[PDB]
Design a protein around this ligand. Structure first.
Ligand SMILES: [Cl-]
Length: 419
């Protein structure tokens, strides 16, 4: 790349061979979990300016170029965000160049030539959706530009929009890239952004997929928002196969069980959003099995215990694998009475090919034999949580199955639901 903006040591740096200078304002926040996760507020002092080396300033009718980054965009909460396009990444000087801008439910790429001809490619996402892949979740952006053909915008490696640009003439962009919310009327607006890159070519579909995969951190489990999953952090649970239900407990102890039951609440602000509630049901807390590692990030193949919170008390997710049948119904046990019940969970973030997939939880007995992935099964018209090796086998012979994929949802200020 010709620009690779990364946090190292105690500063943002360009890791490219150009080592372009970076000026940060006083109100830029870096997430302590991973300081590559940059937070920009709607404040004049919340800005990053890259001073491009002269050699890489864009001034051409013919040179191809691309950009990639990940972004997490908080839910739009009120009418003040309608019909308010605001720049976030600015490389326009003297009315020519490129920029990334946001609006209500949009990510916009703009090219402007030196006669002020414009082309825009746009990603549109709805806030009128039960459970969104995009609202307040880290998503991978890629924009490519071939001066003889098309601009293209990709989301998570998938082509979303393309437009011809061969009618544009000379584009003379800024020698500065300004990361800053410019013209945003929502005082509480922020963005989170990571892994910004600029490339002096049109990336192809394979390069885009490979960049998406390589930047996915796939040896690390992720929460619903795309942040690293953590130990000792309460999470509300979502089963991806039956997303309108939430987890509940039918009594503590081995003679009770955990189950999925309908129906998520409705969150609404008239004409702004209409979503399923996410802060529902029995919270789970992931506990370390292994001694000796201070780190609170949950990694692929980590062994864990799962604690369940019921009326502000913790219990242990567990089962007696001796019960009849392949599907082992899970219970919330008193921790002092866990005895030799099966409770160790292997956490999984990636497939046999090292590609990220949704969180799976493989229950093992105390000898480390698989009891199976945690999902659910219907007994007596109730969707009880289970561990079942049937899931493991289906994955092993198909590489795909349904019911044993989960999301962990912590409270996040980009979502705004009241718990
Ligand atoms: Cl504990």
């Amino acid at each position: 790349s010709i620009l690779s903006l990364r946090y190292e040591n105690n500063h943002l740096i360009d890791l490219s061979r150009y080592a372009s200078k970076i000026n940060i304002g006083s109100r830029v926040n870096f997430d302590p979990i991973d300081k590559n996760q940059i937070q920009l507020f709607n404040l004049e002092s919340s800005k990053i300016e890259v001073i491009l080396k002269n050699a890489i300033v864009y001034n051409s009718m013919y040179e191809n170029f691309s950009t990639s980054f990940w972004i997490k965009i908080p839910k739009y909460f009120s009418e003040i965000s309608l019909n308010n396009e605001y720049t976030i990444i600015n490389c326009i000087e003297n009315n020519s160049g490129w920029k990334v801008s946001l609006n209500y439910g949009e990510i916009i790429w703009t090219l402007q030539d030196n006669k002020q001809n414009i082309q825009r490619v746009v990603f549109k996402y709805s806030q009128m959706v039960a459970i969104s892949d995009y609202i307040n979740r880290w998503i991978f952006i890629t924009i490519t530009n071939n001066r003889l053909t098309k601009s293209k915008i990709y989301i998570n490696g998938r082509l979303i929009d393309q437009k011809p640009i061969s009618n544009l003439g000379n584009i003379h962009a800024s020698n500065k890239i300004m990361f800053k919310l410019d013209g945003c009327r929502d005082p509480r607006r922020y963005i989170m952004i990571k892994y910004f890159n600029l490339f002096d070519k049109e990336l192809n579909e394979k390069e885009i997929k490979d960049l998406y995969d390589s930047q996915s951190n796939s040896g690390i489990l992720k929460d619903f928002w795309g942040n690293y999953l953590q130990y000792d952090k309460p999470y509300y649970m979502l089963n991806l196969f039956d997303p309108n239900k939430y987890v509940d407990v039918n009594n503590v102890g081995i003679r009770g069980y955990m189950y999925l039951k309908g129906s998520r609440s409705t969150l609404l602000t008239t004409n702004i959003y209409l979503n399923s509630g996410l802060y529902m049901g029995t919270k789970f807390i992931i506990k370390k099995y292994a001694s000796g590692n201070k780190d609170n990030i949950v990694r692929n193949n980590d062994r864990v215990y799962i604690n369940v919170v019921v009326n502000n008390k913790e219990y242990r997710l567990a089962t007696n694998a001796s019960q009849a049948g392949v599907e082992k119904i899970l219970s919330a046990l008193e921790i002092p009475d866990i005895g030799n019940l099966s409770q160790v969970v292997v956490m999984k973030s990636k497939n046999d090919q090292g590609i990220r997939n949704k969180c799976k939880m493989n229950l093992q007995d105390n000898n480390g034999n698989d009891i199976g992935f945690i999902g659910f099964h219907k007994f007596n018209d109730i969707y009880k949580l289970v561990a079942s090796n049937w899931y493991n086998r289906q994955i092993e012979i198909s590489s795909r199955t349904f019911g044993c994929s989960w999301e962990f949802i912590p409270v996040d200020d980009g979502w705004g639901e009241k718990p």
